[model samples]
Target: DQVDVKDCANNEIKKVMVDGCHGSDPCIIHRGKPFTLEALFDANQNTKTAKIEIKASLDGLEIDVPGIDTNACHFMKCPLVKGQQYDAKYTWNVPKIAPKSENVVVTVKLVGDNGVLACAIATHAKIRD
Candidate 1:
């Protein structure tokens, strides 16, 4: 409907302000104390617009508590029927408190637009104890 924006952690973006309707669904969270989660998207060849990226890599080692966004899943149009077509989902929450050689990697990337321009991915693996 309307768009125009700019975001810089400490000012190093310079420009990205067209400020008016492109799209968004970027929910990213990276907590601390042994954590690794990544969900992705970067589409806009001619589809419409869809970009979602979540990266959480918390190193070191803590004792208790740290999980963000739950065990991911996203959608743009699912049970929101009408014309139907468009979806998204991403989640990351793996906290057990160390050991077991420690391995965590979740990567999903698909962005911009909808209807055509294919080539999307979702790499997932979960091992519990």
Candidate 2:
């Protein structure tokens, strides 16, 4: 089965990208390896502080993946500017506690002090050894 990425918030940015998994189905990340998720978006409003959040579904429950840093400034340029574009490249080090299989659904949301920057959804991700 192939993984799917789509727009959830219907904002300016509508795409979230995952390497080796965007077009190809079966986004399988080994138990101990890391995978990077990059969200491409343009800032419509300026903000002093910014951050990224990723939610994953495990056992029919949603939880945040604790391995990646939520500090948007670390992955992108600081002090988000209006009309500026950014690609937050988050390298998630797959942890043992990472929810395994059961048809993974990941939601990536970028937020700023002003408001949410943009949002994207990727579904049907598979985790395995």
Q: Top model by TM-score, which number? A: 2
Give me candidate 2's TM-score against the actual structure: 0.83
Off by over 4 Å in 2: 1-3
Error of 1 at 128 (Å): 17
Clash totals in order: 26, 1
Error of 1 at 80 (Å): 25
lDDT per residue as tens, model 2, 1-129: 223567666465734666667474667776678786666678868888787777888656887677666787876778889988777667767887665775777787778888788877766578887
Least accurate stretch of 10 residues (summed lDDT) in model 1? Answer: 12-21
Candidates' C-alpha lDDT: 0.29, 0.72
lDDT of 1 by residue, 1-129 (tens): 211222312221222211111323222223322333221222223333444433322233323323343221234432222233333333334444433223333222333334321232211222334
Highest lDDT among the candidates is held by which one?
2
